[PDB]
C-alpha cells in the first residue's frame, strides 16, 4: 500500500480487501450466480493524526467512485426543530435518484463521517429520561437500512471513542467491519520519512550528511503529522540559516543555496520546534526540580537504587505487567524532586505528571475526567510511567469533619488495579505526606511497595549540606560547627534553603547570629 502515499499499514489494508472488497472485483457473472450482497459500511478508530482520512480518501479513488461527500459530526446539530434530520437526509438524495433512474447499472457513492460518536449515542430506554439527540439516531438508522433498498452506497465512519456508539448501528447489516490504526513502529516511521523526502531527493537538495535511518530511531512516539511538521520545520530552518549567513558574509548566494541541505537543520528542529503528544517532555523537569539534587547523605542513594530496581522489574517481567510504589515522608523532605528524578532516569518513551496545580477551581467530576484522560492516553504506548503528586490535595482533605471527595477516591482505587491491554507495561509513582490517613481509608494495601524519605538528623550532615551549597566561609563554618556539633538536629532541605536566604538579607556582621537564632526557634525533635 506504500505506492499510493501511505506507509506503515499493510496488514490493516490486506484484511480490508478480504473482508469487504473481494466481491467488487470478482467477475460479475459468478457473483450474481452466488447471490451475495456487498458490505455496506466500515468503522475506523484510533489516536488522531495517524492517517484515517487519508486512507478513506484513497479507498474510494481505488474503486473508480464519484467524489466523496465529507461530513463533520459536530456541525450538523441545529437548535430549531427538524433541521438536523433534514441535514442528515440531504446526503442520500443523489444516490436514491440515480438508482431509481438507472436500475442496477449505476455508479458508486461514498459518504465519510468524521467524529461520528458526537451524534450517535446509546438511546435511553427509560421513559422520561430520553436523550436530546435521539431523533438524529433514529433518522440515521432508518436511512442506512430501511424498507426501500439501496445497493449503490458505501459509508465510512471515523471515531476515537468506539465504546460510546449505539449498538444497533454495529450489527452485521450496518457497519460490520472494524479496524484499528495505532502509532507507527520504526519501520512505519522509516517508510513515512521516505515518502515525505522523495521530492527533495528528486530535486537534489538532500545532502549526503543526512541519514534518514538514524533519524528514524530518534523519533520514538511520533505520528505521521508530526513527522511532516518536522520535515517542514527543517526546511524553514535551512532557509533561515541561508538568509542570515548570506546577509552577514559576502559570499555568492548560489554557494549558500547549495549549503541549505545540511543535517544541522534537522537536529535543531527535533529539539526546539516539535513537541510530541505521546512522548517525553523536558519542560516539566525544570519546573519540578528547580535546584538540582545534592548528595548530603546515604539515604538518597538508597532511594534511587530502590527506584532503579523497580524500573528494571517493570521492564523485565511477564507475570506482573503493572507495578505501584508510594513515597512517604515528613513535610518539606523533598518527595516531588526524587520522584521526578526517578522518572527522568527511567528512560521510557512515555512519561507524564499529574498534579493539582492545573485543576484550580475544578469540580470533582472534571478532575475524574482529567485523570481518566491521562490514563487512557498512557494505555496507547508499549512502556509507560505516570506520577500522581500530593494525593491528599486531590482528595480535598481537611482535618475538621473530616471532609473529602469520595468520587475521586473510588476512581483512584479502581484505577490502581486495572491492567493495560495485552503486552503493554505501566509504572505508577505516588507521593503523599500523611500516610496514616491513607491507611485509614484502606488505600495503603492497593500499592505494592513503600519508600521512606527521611529528614536531616545530625550536625555533620547539616555541615556537609552547607558545604555543598557553599554559602558560609571558613570562620563562620567553624563557629557553626562548634555551636551545633551536637547531633540533635531536625530540619528539611526545602526549609533549610529558605532559612539561608532569609539570613543572607542582613548586614555582613549580623548574619551568623540570625541564622543560629532562626535554627534554634525551629523544632529539634520529632
Amino acid at each position: 500500500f506504500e505506492k499510493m502515499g501511505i506507509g506503515g499499514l499493510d496488514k490493516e489494508f490486506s484484511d480490508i480487501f478480504r473482508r469487504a472488497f473481494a466481491s467488487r472485483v470478482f467477475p460479475p457473472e459468478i457473483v450474481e450466480q452466488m447471490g451475495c450482497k456487498h458490505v455496506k459500511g466500515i468503522l475506523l478508530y484510533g489516536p488522531p493524526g495517524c492517517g484515517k482520512t487519508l486512507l478513506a480518501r484513497q479507498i474510494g479513488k481505488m474503486l473508480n467512485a464519484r467524489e466523496p461527500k465529507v461530513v463533520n459530526g459536530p456541525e450538523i446539530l441545529n437548535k430549531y426543530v427538524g433541521e438536523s434530520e433534514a441535514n442528515i437526509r440531504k446526503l442520500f438524495a443523489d444516490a436514491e435518484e440515480e438508482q431509481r433512474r438507472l436500475g442496477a447499472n449505476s455508479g458508486l457513492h461514498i459518504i465519510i463521517f468524521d467524529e461520528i460518536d458526537a451524534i450517535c449515542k446509546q438511546r435511553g430506554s427509560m421513559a422520561g429520561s430520553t436523550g436530546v439527540h435521539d431523533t438524529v439516531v433514529n433518522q440515521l438508522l432508518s436511512k442506512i437500512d430501511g424498507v426501500e433498498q439501496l445497493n449503490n452506497i458505501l459509508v465510512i465512519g471515523m471515531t476515537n471513542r468506539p465504546d460510546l456508539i449505539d449498538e444497533a448501528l454495529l450489527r452485521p447489516g450496518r457497519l460490520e467491519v472494524k479496524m484499528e490504526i495505532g502509532l507507527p513502529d520504526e519501520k512505519g516511521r522509516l517508510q513515512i520519512l521516505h515518502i515525505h523526502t522523495a521530492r527533495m531527493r528528486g530535486h537534489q537538495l538532500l545532502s549526503a550528511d543526512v541519514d534518514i535511518k538514524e533519524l528514524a530511531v530518534e523519533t520514538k512516539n511520533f505520528s505521521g503529522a508530526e513527522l511532516e511538521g518536522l520535515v517542514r520545520a527543517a526546511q524553514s530552518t535551512a532557509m533561515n540559516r541561508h538568509i542570515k549567513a548570506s546577509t552577514k558574509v559576502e559570499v555568492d548566494m548560489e554557494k549558500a543555496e547549495s549549503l541549505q541541505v545540511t543535517r544541522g537543520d534537522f537536529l535543531a528542529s527535533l529539539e526546539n520546534d516539535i513537541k510530541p503528544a505521546f512522548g517525553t517532555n523536558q519542560e516539566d523537569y525544570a519546573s519540578y526540580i528547580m535546584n538540582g539534587i545534592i548528595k548530603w547523605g546515604d539515604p538518597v542513594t538508597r532511594v534511587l537504587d530502590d527506584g532503579e530496581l523497580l524500573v528494571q522489574q517493570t521492564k523485565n517481567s511477564d507475570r506482573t505487567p503493572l507495578v505501584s510504589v508510594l513515597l512517604e515522608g515528613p513535610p518539606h523532605s523533598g518527595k516531588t524532586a526524587l520522584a521526578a528524578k526517578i522518572a527522568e532516569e527511567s528512560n521510557f518513551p512515555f512519561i507524564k505528571i499529574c498534579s493539582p496545580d492545573k485543576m484550580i477551581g475544578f469540580s470533582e467530576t472534571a478532575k475524574c475526567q482529567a485523570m481518566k484522560k491521562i490514563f487512557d492516553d498512557a494505555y496507547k504506548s508499549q512502556l509507560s510511567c505516570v506520577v500522581v503528586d500530593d494525593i491528599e490535595r486531590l482528595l480535598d482533605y481537611v482535618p475538621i469533619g473530616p471532609r473529602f471527595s469520595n468520587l475521586v477516591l473510588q476512581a483512584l482505587l479502581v484505577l490502581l488495579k486495572k491492567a493495560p491491554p495485552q503486552g503493554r507495561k505501566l509504572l505508577i509513582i505516588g507521593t503523599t505526606s500523611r500516610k496514616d490517613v491513607l491507611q485509614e481509608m484502606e488505600m495503603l494495601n492497593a500499592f505494592s511497595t513503600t519508600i521512606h524519605v527521611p529528614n536531616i538528623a545530625t550536625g555533620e550532615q547539616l555541615l556537609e549540606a552547607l558545604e555543598l551549597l557553599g554559602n558560609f566561609k571558613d570562620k563562620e563554618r567553624t563557629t557553626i560547627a562548634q555551636q551545633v556539633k551536637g547531633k540533635k538536629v531536625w530540619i528539611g532541605i526545602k526549609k533549610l534553603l529558605m532559612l539561608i536566604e532569609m539570613s543572607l538579607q542582613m548586614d555582613p556582621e549580623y548574619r551568623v547570629r540570625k541564622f543560629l537564632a532562626l535554627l534554634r526557634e525551629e523544632g529539634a525533635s520529632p
Binding site: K79, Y80, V81, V132
Partner: peptide
C-alpha cells in the same frame, strides 16, 4: 436542551 419552538412568518407583496 429543548429545541426551539415554532415561529410565525411575515410576508411581502410585489407588483408586476
Amino acid at each position: 436542551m429543548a429545541e426551539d419552538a415554532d415561529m410565525r412568518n411575515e410576508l411581502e407583496e410585489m407588483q408586476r
